[PDB]
Assembly symmetry: C2
Homo-oligomer: 100 residues x 2
């Protein structure tokens, strides 16, 4: 039953550009399936996004396939991409964050 990653709910993913006021919380999701369970990682502007990249750091909820950034600030604007992978494939989606 092995199978490459696939998005399980594209509805959540249709809204690509997000404009949010500073200090609000943004949450990005890339619901996925696959056998074996794929892993997920996030890039910000094409480069690995790490905890130390912003003051507030960030939360990853694997069960919900989401990236959460609390109290956004202007320097958080950018492109956020979820890369999901397993031995049979690697797929990605990109969101754009604009901080109003």
């Amino acid at each position: 039953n092995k199978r490459a990653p696939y998005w399980t709910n594209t509805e959540k993913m249709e809204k690509r550009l997000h404009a949010v006021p500073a200090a609000n919380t943004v949450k990005f999701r890339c619901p996925a399936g696959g056998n074996p369970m794929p892993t997920m990682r996030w890039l910000k502007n094409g480069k690995e996004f790490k905890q130390e990249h912003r003051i507030g750091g960030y939360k990853v909820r694997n069960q919900h396939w989401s990236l959460i950034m609390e109290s956004v600030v202007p320097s958080d604007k950018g492109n956020y991409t979820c890369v999901v992978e397993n031995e049979y494939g690697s797929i990605n989606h990109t969101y754009h964050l604009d901080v109003v």
Copy 2:
């Protein structure tokens, strides 16, 4: 509307192991979708499978996402994998061919 490759009809793909008498024709398919249109390539035992690898050569029908090998011979046994890709992702599936 950009989107990574995805299989559009997994039904065709459920039968992974194929045992076929010599001299018969085998056809493998990996129906796929994605935006932009993904490309497809085939590997035989993990390595690029080229026309010169077998006497009969092989047919690729892009419209139907299939690899066709006429008059199979014992040396054709092996693992056949369709790799489908576009800028948003790369996915693969593997079939096993046994020549009876």
